[PDB]
Amino acid sequence: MAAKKDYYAILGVPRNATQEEIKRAYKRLARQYHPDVNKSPEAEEKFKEINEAYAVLSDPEKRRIYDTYGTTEAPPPPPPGGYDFSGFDVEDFSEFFQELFGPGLFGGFGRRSRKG
Numbered sequence: 001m002a003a004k005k006d007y008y009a010i011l012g013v014p015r016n017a018t019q020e021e022i023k024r025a026y027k028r029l030a031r032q033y034h035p036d037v038n039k040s041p042e043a044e045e046k047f048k049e050i051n052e053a054y055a056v057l058s059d060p061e062k063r064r065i066y067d068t069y070g071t072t073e074a075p076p077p078p079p080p081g082g083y084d085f086s087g088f089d090v091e092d093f094s095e096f097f098q099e100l101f102g103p104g105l106f107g108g109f110g111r112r113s114r115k116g
Contacts, residue, residue: 001072002095007053019059026054052093055085055101066100080107 008015011025031037033047056062069077083090083104090097091105098105 001070001074002099003070005049005052005094005096007056007066007096010049010053011057013057017057019057022054022057026050026057048093051088052090052097055088055090055093055097066096069100070096077101077103080104 008017011022011029013021013025017025029046029050033043033050035044035047056066065077069075077100080103083101085091085101085105090101
């Protein structure tokens with residue numbers, strides 16, 4: 001329920017956007033925050049968010065995951081390891097991604113207890 005980042009707002013597309021407008025919405029922003037173009041700590045952070053937004057917005061397959069989940073009440077996500085993230089480095093993205101795909105990225109480390 002880390003409602004601090006609307007993935008659609010980050011790219012500049014509506015909720016029921018077509019994948020056509022989503023992909024070019026990544027491309028436009030990528031060039032602005034690319035380190036060779038713009039080597040600022042103010043850029044690197046947005047460069048995460050646009051790739052984070054597009055990591056979910058790449059397919060309606062992932063868009064529906066964060067749509068049906070993304071609350072505290074939301075059912076437990078699919079078993080760890082069963083996520084595609086190669087060439088994104090999604091473990092470095094923020095809480096809203098780390099609540100959904102993150103438990104699968106880590107696989108549950110620390111050897112911690114849980115409440116129910």
